[PDB]
Amino acid sequence: VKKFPEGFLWGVATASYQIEGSPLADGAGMSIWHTFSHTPGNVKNGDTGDVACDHYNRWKEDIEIIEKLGVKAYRFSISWPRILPEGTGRVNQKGLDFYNRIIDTLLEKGITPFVTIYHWDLPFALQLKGGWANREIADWFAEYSRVLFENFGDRVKNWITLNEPWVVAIVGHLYGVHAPGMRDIYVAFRAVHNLLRAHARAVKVFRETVKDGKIGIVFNNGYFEPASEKIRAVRFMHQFNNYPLFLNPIYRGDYPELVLEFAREYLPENYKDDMSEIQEKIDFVGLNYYSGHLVKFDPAKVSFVERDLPKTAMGWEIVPEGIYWILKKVKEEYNPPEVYITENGAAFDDVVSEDGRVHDQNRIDYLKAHIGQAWKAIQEGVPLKGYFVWSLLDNFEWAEGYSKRFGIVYVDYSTQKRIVKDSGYWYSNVVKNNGLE
């Protein structure tokens, strides 16, 4: 058997825009994902988050699913423009009420809330003022975070400032594939820097407002392996695409060496002036992990090399040892006091069989392998306190729309029916047993 530490936090994760629907209900302002998805050409099939999983109405049912599965923690995000419709200034009580009911329900049912303050749904009003490109967002984000802390910090004790600031900056402002859909490398690196400044300011406010409780930050990570033994390209991909881009500032007070080699000219001229503030002490690091990649130098002087490995419906290579590597590596490089796996999961072409069940053995095999590697990292000293499956529900998968299903629960979008998949049932047994057998 593979048993986890006593009180290890087994969880599931979601994000507001991906599951809620009703983006403009009850006085909410538009987000940048509302306007981006309503722009033709940006999202597969013209899909939007207008309805999604209708969690805005079905939240109680969904939480009852978490309870019934015996899952111990729920990672969810708060929609900034539901709380402050113009981004700063006015606070919307109906937006607070929505999350208040979720928080109280979770606590009543003995489920630990983990709140992501920002999972990509920036208020549109702030994007008109440059969004993450504007230095003033450190102030706007701090004011937003302070409202959440004042309203919920009595009950919610586990907070995450940002989900995947690399994705927000680079996919949103360089690749242009995510909101706000820009392609400018100078803007993208100023977003990187302002995301760090905003994170640190929010942590600073947290220490002033919520006497009890812990705050951290979540990074996307890939497992990069070299295509040959000629290695530096892997080095750069790790430092740029993984936690070091942000953790080197936080722990060491500067960007990683190979990031500066690539991107110095794109960063603000006096960016180091902000570094002492960026070193604000954090309580844990959240790592998201899904895929491994074979990488070679290619005259960012990096290209991916396709491997003949099992892949998910995203085309992502399944490399379970990657989750072990990233956990070992984070300890070795920055030694954070606590780590969580804040997302791990897979998209497959799920079908409801004639027997009414969703037989996703492929997803079971994926989760089991990665949970096994996480267990290993714990045996070797990594202070992993929890593990969150992405996602509770099939949902709006950003620019892929509804075409990619990551849930351990199937959603029939025609009826909003939830069908617990085989992977959901399997996971519930893992949680009940506190591990694998």
Q: Which of 149, 406, 410, 427 binds ligand GI4 (CB under 6 A)?
A: 406
Q: Tell which positions 9-38 bind ligand GI4, by CB under 6 A.
A: 15
**Nearest-CB residue to ligand GI4?**
220
Q: How far is the CB of 355 from ligand GI4 (least distance, A)?
A: 28
Would you say 387 or 406 has its CB closer to ligand GI4?
A: 406
Judged by CB under 6 A, the stretch of 135-143, 162-170, 226-234, 351-359 that binds ligand GI4 is 162-170
Chain mean position to CA 393: 15
Q: How far is the CB of 167 from ligand GI4 (least distance, A)?
A: 5
Q: What is the DSSP letter of 30?
A: P
Judged by CB under 6 A, the stretch of 78-86, 163-171, 371-379, 407-415 that binds ligand GI4 is 163-171
Q: Rule CB under 6 A: say whether 394 interacts with ligand GI4.
A: no
Q: How far is the CB of 397 from ligand GI4 (least distance, A)?
A: 5
Q: Which of 31, 48, 288, 423 binds ligand GI4 (CB under 6 A)?
A: 288
Q: What is the DSSP letter of 28?
A: P
Rg (CA), the chain: 20
Q: How far is the CB of 395 from ligand GI4 (least distance, A)?
A: 7
Active-site entry in 20, 164, 280, 397: 164
Give the dihedral sign, CA 353/74/148/287.
negative
Nearest Cα to Cα of residue 386 among 10, 75, 20? 10
Judged by CB under 6 A, the stretch of 144-152, 159-167, 200-208, 300-308 that binds ligand GI4 is 159-167
Our answer to whether residue 343 is catalytic in this structure is yes
Would you say 88 or 220 has its CB closer to ligand GI4?
A: 220
Q: Rule CB under 6 A: say whether 167 interacts with ligand GI4.
A: yes
Question: Residue length, the chain?
Answer: 437
Nearest Cα to Cα of residue 383 among 312, 308, 287, 306? 287
SS3 category, 313? coil
Q: Rule CB under 6 A: say whether 53 interacts with ligand GI4.
A: no
What letter represents residue 32's amino acid?
I
Q: Which of 132, 290, 325, 348 binds ligand GI4 (CB under 6 A)?
A: 290
Nearest Cα to Cα of residue 377 among 430, 340, 427? 340
Q: Rule CB under 6 A: say whether 397 interacts with ligand GI4.
A: yes
Q: Which of 164, 225, 280, 394 binds ligand GI4 (CB under 6 A)?
A: 164
Active-site entry in 20, 225, 343, 397: 343
CA distance 156 to 21: 24
Contact in structure between 152 and 163 (CB atoms under 8 Å): no
Judged by CB under 6 A, the stretch of 90-98, 104-112, 139-147, 160-168 that binds ligand GI4 is 160-168
SS3 category, 164? coil
First and final CA of the chain: distance in angstroms? Answer: 4
Q: Rule CB under 6 A: say whether 343 interacts with ligand GI4.
A: yes
Question: Does residue 391 have a cis peptide bond before it, meaning omega lies within 30 degrees of 0?
Answer: yes
Contact in structure between 301 and 245 (CB atoms under 8 Å): no
Q: What are phi and psi of 50, to 5 degrees?
A: -55, -40
Contact in structure between 253 and 275 (CB atoms under 8 Å): yes
Q: Tell which positions 200-229 bind ligand GI4, by CB under 6 A.
A: 220
Positions touching ligand GI4 (CB under 6 A) are 15, 163-164, 167, 220, 288, 290, 343, 390, 397, 406
Active site residues: 164, 343
